[PDB]
Design a protein around this ligand. Structure first.
Ligand code: MG
Length: 221
């Protein structure tokens, strides 16, 4: 039986993506840049905050000093941090609360493996801190998501090897990160984005202790 479950936050535990989208959109509008719609934002995923801001500036061929550049980047983050102040327990994805309860009562380790610099704050706002045994700190991770580093740090933080874990993800890079760490991935989304070689649930309400166990069993080969 697996000894720990490693959680990504966005797309699994809750949604932050919409908040990032709105923040960028507020910055753009603040400096009169138009075109940052739910279409363009799709090109801002898995990209750096610097690269994203640049893409946005390239929309209006807007030039700015390296100074004004860093300040714009900071503004986007401040908007984001302001926007997440209202995150609450109601924002927890379906099935997640019960899964955490079930894992805890089954003595299965729980760890956050997220790039979010606001992970601890967000879990406290959703009232989930007490379920987590460890939070892998994004700033201590040398290589981002595609790399297995963070799932490896998250597993070690709870005293297990990744090979004794299951990783829950909503992104292709995340799925790859889990595979390369040696943990068993179970994605949420659709094969077209995630891949055809892993178990996938359409929505998180299907992430139950019973389902995880059956998947872990049917893995033994
Ligand atoms: Mg995610």
């Amino acid at each position: 039986m697996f000894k720990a479950v490693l959680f990504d936050l966005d797309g699994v535990i809750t949604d932050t993506a919409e908040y990032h989208f709105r923040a960028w959109k507020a910055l753009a509008e603040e400096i009169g840049i138009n075109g940052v719609d739910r279409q363009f934002n799709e090109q801002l995923k898995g990209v750096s905050r610097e690269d994203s801001l640049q893409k946005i500036l390239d929309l209006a061929d807007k030039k700015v000093s390296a100074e004004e550049f860093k300040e714009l980047a900071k503004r986007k983050n401040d908007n984001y941090v302001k926007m997440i102040q209202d995150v609450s327990p109601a924002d927890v994805y379906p099935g997640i609360l019960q899964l955490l309860k079930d894992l805890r009562s089954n003595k299965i380790k729980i760890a956050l493996a997220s790039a979010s610099k606001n992970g601890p704050f967000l879990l406290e706002r959703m009232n989930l801190t007490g379920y987590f045994d460890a939070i892998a700190d994004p700033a201590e991770v040398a290589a981002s998501k595609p790399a297995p580093d963070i799932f490896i740090a998250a597993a070690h933080a709870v005293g297990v090897a990744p090979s004794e874990s299951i990783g829950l993800e909503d992104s292709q890079a995340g799925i790859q990160a889990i595979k390369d760490s040696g943990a068993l991935p179970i994605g949420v989304g659709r094969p077209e984005d995630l891949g055809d070689d892993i178990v996938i649930v359409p929505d998180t309400s299907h992430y139950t202790l019973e389902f995880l166990k059956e998947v872990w069993l049917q893995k033994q080969k």
